[PDB]
Short mmCIF file of C-alpha atoms in Angstrom, two decimals:
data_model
loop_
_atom_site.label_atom_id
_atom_site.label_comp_id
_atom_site.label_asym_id
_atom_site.label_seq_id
_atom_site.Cartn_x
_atom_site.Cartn_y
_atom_site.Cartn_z
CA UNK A 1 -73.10 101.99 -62.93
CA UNK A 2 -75.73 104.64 -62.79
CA UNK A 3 -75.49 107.35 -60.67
CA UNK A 4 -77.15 107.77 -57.42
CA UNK A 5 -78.73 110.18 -55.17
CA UNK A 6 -76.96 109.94 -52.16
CA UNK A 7 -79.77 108.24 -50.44
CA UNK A 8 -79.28 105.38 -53.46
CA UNK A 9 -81.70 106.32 -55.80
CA UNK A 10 -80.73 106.56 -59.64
CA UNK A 11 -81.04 110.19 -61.03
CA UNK A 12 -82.32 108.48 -64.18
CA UNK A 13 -85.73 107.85 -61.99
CA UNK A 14 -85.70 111.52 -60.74
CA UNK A 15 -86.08 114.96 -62.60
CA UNK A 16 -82.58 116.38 -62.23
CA UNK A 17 -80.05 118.36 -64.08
CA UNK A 18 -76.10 118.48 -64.59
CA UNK A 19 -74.24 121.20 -63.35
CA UNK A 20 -70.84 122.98 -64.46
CA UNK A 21 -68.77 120.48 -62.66
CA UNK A 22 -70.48 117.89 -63.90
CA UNK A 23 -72.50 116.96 -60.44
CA UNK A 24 -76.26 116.14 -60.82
CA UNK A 25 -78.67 118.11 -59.46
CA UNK A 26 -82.58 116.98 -58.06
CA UNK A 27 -85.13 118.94 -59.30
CA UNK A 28 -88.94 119.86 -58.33
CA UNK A 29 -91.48 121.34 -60.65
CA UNK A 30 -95.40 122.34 -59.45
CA UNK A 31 -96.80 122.83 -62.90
CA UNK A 32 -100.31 124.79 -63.11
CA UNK A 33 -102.56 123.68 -65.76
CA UNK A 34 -102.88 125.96 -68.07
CA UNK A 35 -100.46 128.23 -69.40
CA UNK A 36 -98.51 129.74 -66.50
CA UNK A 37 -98.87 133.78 -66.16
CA UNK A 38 -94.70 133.30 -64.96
CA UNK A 39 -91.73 131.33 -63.24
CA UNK A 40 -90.80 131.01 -59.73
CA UNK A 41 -87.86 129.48 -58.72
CA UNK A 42 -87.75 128.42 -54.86
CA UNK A 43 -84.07 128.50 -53.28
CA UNK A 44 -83.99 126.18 -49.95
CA UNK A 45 -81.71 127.49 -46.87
CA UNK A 46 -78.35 125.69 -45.41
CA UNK A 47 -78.62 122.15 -44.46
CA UNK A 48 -82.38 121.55 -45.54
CA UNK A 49 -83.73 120.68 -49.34
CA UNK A 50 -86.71 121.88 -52.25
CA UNK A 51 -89.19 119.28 -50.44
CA UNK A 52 -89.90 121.43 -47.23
CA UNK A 53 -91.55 124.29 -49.54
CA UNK A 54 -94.62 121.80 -51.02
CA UNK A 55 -97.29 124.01 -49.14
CA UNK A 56 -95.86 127.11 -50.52
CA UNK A 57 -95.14 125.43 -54.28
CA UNK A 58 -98.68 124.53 -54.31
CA UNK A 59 -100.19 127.75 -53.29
CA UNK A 60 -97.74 129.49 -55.82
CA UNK A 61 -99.18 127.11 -58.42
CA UNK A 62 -102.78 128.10 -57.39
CA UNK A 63 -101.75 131.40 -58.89
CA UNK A 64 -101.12 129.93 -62.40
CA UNK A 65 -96.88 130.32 -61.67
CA UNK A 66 -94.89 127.70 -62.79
CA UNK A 67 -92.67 126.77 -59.73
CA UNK A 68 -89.17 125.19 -59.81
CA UNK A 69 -86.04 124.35 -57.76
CA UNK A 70 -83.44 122.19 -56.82
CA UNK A 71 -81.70 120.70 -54.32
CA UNK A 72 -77.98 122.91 -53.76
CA UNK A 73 -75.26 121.10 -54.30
CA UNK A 74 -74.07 119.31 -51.12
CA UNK A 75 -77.85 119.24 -49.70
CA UNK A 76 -81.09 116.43 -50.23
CA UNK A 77 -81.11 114.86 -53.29
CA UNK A 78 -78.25 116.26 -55.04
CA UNK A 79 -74.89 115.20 -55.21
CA UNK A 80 -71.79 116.78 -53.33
CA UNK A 81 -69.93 116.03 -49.75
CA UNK A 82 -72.43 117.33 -47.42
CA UNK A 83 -72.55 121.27 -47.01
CA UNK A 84 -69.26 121.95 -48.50
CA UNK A 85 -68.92 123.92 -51.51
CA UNK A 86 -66.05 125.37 -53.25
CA UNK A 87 -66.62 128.44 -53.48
CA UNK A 88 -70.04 130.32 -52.56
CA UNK A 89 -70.84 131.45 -55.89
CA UNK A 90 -71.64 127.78 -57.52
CA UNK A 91 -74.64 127.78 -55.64
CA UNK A 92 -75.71 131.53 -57.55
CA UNK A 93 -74.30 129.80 -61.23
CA UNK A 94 -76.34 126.84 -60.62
CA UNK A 95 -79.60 128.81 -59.88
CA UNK A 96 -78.58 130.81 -63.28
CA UNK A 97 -78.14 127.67 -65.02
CA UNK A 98 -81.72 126.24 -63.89
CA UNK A 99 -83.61 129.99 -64.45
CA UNK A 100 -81.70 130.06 -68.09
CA UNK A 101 -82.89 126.22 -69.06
CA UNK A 102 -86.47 127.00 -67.71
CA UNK A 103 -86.56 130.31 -69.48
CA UNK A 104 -85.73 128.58 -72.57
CA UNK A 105 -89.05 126.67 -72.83
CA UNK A 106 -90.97 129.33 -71.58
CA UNK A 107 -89.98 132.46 -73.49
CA UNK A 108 -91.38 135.81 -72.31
CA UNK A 109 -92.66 134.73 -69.13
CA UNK A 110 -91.87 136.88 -65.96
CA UNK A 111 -89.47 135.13 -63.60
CA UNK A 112 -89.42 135.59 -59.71
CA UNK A 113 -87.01 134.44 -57.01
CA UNK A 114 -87.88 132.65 -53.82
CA UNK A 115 -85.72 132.29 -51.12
CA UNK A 116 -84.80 131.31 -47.06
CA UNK A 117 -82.12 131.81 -45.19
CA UNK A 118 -78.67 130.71 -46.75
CA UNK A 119 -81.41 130.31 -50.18
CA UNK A 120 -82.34 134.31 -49.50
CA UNK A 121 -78.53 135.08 -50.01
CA UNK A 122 -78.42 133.17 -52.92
CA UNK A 123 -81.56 134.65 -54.36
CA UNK A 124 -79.84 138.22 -53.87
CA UNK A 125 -77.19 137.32 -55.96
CA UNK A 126 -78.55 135.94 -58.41
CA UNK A 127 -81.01 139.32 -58.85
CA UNK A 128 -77.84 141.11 -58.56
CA UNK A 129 -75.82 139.36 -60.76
CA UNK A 130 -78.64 140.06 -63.03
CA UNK A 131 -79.57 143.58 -62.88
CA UNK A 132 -83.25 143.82 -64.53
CA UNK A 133 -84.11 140.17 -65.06
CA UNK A 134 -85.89 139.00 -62.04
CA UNK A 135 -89.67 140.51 -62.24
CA UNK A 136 -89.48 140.08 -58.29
CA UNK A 137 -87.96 138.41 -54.95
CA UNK A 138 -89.73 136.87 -52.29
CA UNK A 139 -86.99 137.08 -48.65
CA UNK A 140 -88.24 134.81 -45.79
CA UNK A 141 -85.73 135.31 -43.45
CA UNK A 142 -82.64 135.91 -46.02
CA UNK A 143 -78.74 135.53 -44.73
CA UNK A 144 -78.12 138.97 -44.50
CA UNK A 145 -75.96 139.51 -41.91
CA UNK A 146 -72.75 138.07 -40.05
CA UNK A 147 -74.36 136.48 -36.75
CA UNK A 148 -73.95 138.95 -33.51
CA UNK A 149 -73.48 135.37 -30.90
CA UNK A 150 -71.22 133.22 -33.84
CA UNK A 151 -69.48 135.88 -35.60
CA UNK A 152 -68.14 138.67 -34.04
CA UNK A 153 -65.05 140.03 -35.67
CA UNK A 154 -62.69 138.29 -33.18
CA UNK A 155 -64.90 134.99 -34.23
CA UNK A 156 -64.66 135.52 -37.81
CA UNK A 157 -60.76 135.88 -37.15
CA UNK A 158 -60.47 132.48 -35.05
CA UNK A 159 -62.48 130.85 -38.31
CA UNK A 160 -60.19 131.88 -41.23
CA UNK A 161 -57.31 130.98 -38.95
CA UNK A 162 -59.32 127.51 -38.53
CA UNK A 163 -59.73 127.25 -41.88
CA UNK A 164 -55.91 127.34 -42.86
CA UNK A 165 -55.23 124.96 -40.15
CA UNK A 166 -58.22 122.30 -39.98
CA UNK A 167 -60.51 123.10 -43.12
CA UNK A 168 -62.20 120.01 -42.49
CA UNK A 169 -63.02 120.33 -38.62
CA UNK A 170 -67.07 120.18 -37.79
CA UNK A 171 -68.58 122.63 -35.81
CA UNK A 172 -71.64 121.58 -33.97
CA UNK A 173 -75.32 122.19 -34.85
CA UNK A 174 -77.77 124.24 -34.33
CA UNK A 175 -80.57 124.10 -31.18
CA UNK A 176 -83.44 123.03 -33.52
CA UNK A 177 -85.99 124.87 -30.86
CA UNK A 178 -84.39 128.29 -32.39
CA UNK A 179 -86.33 127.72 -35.75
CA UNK A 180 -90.00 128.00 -34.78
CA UNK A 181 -92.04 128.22 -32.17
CA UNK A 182 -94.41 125.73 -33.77
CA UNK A 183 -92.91 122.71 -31.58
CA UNK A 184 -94.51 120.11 -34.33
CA UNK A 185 -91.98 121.90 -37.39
CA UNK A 186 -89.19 121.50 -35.73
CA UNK A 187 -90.13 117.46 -34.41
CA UNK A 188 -90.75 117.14 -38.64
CA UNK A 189 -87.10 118.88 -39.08
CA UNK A 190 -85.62 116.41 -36.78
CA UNK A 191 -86.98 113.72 -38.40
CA UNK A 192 -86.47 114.27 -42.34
CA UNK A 193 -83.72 112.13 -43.09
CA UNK A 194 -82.75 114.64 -46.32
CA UNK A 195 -82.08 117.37 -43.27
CA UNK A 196 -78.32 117.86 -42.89
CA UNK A 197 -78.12 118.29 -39.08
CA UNK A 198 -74.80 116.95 -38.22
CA UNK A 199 -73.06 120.44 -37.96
CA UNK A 200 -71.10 123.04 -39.96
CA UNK A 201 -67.60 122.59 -41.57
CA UNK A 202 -65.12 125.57 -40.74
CA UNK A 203 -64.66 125.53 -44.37
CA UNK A 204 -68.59 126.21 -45.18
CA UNK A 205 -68.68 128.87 -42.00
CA UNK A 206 -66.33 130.64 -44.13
CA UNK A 207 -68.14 130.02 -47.31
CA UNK A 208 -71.19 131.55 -45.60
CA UNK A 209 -69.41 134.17 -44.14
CA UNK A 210 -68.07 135.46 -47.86
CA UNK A 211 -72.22 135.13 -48.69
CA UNK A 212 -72.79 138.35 -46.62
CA UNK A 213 -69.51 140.51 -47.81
CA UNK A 214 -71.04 139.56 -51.32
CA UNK A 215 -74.52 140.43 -50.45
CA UNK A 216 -73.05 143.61 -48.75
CA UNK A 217 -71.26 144.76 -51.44
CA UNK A 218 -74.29 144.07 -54.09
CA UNK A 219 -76.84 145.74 -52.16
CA UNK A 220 -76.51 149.42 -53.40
CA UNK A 221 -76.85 147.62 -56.94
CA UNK A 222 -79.90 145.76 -56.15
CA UNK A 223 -82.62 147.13 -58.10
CA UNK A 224 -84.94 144.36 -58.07
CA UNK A 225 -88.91 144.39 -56.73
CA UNK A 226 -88.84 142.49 -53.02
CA UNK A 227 -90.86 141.04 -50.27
CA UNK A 228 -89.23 140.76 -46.93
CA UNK A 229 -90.17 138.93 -44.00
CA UNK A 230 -88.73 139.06 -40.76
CA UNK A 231 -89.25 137.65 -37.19
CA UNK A 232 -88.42 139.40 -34.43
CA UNK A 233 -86.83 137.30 -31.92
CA UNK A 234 -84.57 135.39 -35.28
CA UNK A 235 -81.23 134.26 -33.44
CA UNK A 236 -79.86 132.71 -36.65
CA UNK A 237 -80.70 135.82 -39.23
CA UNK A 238 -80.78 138.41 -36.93
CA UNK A 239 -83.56 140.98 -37.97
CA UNK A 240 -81.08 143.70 -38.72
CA UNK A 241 -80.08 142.36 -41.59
CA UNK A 242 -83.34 143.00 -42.75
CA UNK A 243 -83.52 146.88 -41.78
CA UNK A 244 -80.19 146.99 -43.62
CA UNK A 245 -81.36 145.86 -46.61
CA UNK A 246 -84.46 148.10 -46.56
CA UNK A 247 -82.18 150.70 -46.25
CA UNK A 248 -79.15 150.06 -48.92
CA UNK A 249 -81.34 148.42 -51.28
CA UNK A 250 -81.83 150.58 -54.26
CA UNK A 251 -85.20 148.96 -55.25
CA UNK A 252 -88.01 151.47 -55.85
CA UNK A 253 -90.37 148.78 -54.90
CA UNK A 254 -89.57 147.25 -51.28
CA UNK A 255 -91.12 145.91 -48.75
CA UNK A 256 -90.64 144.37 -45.08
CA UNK A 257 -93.07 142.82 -43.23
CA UNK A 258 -92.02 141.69 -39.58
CA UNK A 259 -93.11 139.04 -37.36
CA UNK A 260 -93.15 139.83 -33.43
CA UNK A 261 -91.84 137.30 -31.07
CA UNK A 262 -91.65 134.73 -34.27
CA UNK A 263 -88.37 132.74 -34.23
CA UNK A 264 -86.54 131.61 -38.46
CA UNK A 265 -88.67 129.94 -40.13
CA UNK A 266 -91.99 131.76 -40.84
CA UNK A 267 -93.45 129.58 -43.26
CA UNK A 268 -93.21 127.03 -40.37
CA UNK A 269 -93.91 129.12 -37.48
CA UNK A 270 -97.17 129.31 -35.25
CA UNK A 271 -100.60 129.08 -37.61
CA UNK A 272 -101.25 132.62 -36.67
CA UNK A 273 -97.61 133.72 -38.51
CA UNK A 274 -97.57 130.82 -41.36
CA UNK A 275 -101.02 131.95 -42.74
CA UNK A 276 -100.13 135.46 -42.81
CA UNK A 277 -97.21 134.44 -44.37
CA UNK A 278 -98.52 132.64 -47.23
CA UNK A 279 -101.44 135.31 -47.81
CA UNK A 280 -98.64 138.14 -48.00
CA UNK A 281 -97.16 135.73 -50.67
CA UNK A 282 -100.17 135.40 -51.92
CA UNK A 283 -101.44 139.00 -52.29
CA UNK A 284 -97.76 140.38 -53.29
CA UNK A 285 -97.06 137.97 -56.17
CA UNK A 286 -100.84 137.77 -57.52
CA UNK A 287 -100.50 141.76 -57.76
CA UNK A 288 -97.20 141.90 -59.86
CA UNK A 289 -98.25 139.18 -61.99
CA UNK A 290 -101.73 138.82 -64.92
#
């Protein structure tokens, strides 16, 4: 038989790719015109997929970049058991694997990272990972830090002893109202059927929570150009992250913008913080790129 997406649709209809276990992946491309001045791969947070950044694709693509992504494995279109992985770091080798075949067909272009959330971690190890490949990261919101409400260190203790004991046992989900103030984003987030919103497995808490000792530990190696946004009032990625990695960063070329009173997702927030959002995109990519 072919294989599937996991809503039933054959990857041979779809642009995807095969990863190092041998699981396909779905792909999106926004491909300018002309000859692109670069490559920008976009790298989608926990439980969500590439579809929810068309409005920013297609702005990025206004700019003559050539934007990609995928679905990670165990979200949307790809394949996987839903938001499990086996170890945090196939998500980073998969992104490498993507960046590498895209490269390939594109030599000497600039490439940039994109990334939200869970996708924001990601994005910083892959840069890292990489020391003086990226030409630039974009942060919306990046997983930066353990949660203070979820994770405190007695928290993180009861999870790894969870995680011997019942891997497998589901946590329950987020309040959707915690990701935006715009109250029509989060009635579309409720309502996308490739939204994973049935809860975390201890198992992925922990995978998550290995994320930000990795990010941690890479951050006085991180040398890479970066935009950073931020809300204020974030309950999931609590804005300290973000004044930590302004601070341990060793980038010569940083940047954080933040958001006051916005909630986690700022390129889905109130008009007033989704426009600026996409114009500080705009402005900081269209200057490090010709």
């Amino acid at each position: 038989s072919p294989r599937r997406t996991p809503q039933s649709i054959p990857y041979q209809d779809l642009p995807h790719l095969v990863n190092a276990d041998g699981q396909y992946l779905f792909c999106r491309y926004w491909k300018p015109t002309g000859t692109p001045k670069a490559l920008i791969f976009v790298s989608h947070g926990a439980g969500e997929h590439s579809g929810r950044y068309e409005e920013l694709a297609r702005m990025l693509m206004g700019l003559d970049l050539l934007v990609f992504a995928h679905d990670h494995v165990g979200h949307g279109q790809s394949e996987g058991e839903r938001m499990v992985v086996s170890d945090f770091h196939v998500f980073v080798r998969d992104v490498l694997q993507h960046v590498d075949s895209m490269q390939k067909d594109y030599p000497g272009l600039p490439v940039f990272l994109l990334g939200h959330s869970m996708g924001g971690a990601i994005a910083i190890l892959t840069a890292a990972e990489r020391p003086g490949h990226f030409a630039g990261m974009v942060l919306i919101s990046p997983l930066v830090l353990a949660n203070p409400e979820s994770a405190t260190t007695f928290k993180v203790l009861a999870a790894k002893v969870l995680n011997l004991v019942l891997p497998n046992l589901s946590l329950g989900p987020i309040d959707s109202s915690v990701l935006s103030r715009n109250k029509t984003e989060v009635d579309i987030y409720n309502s996308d059927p490739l939204i994973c919103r049935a809860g975390l497995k201890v198992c992925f808490g922990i995978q998550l929570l290995n994320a930000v000792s990795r990010v941690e530990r890479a951050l006085p190696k991180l040398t890479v150009p970066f935009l950073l946004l931020q809300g204020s009032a974030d309950r999931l990625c609590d804005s300290k992250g973000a004044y930590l990695l302004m601070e341990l960063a060793k980038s010569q070329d940083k940047t954080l913008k933040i958001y006051e009173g916005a909630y986690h997702v700022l390129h889905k927030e109130l008009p007033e913080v989704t426009n600026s959002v996409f114009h500080e995109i705009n402005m900081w990519v269209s200057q490090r790129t010709a």
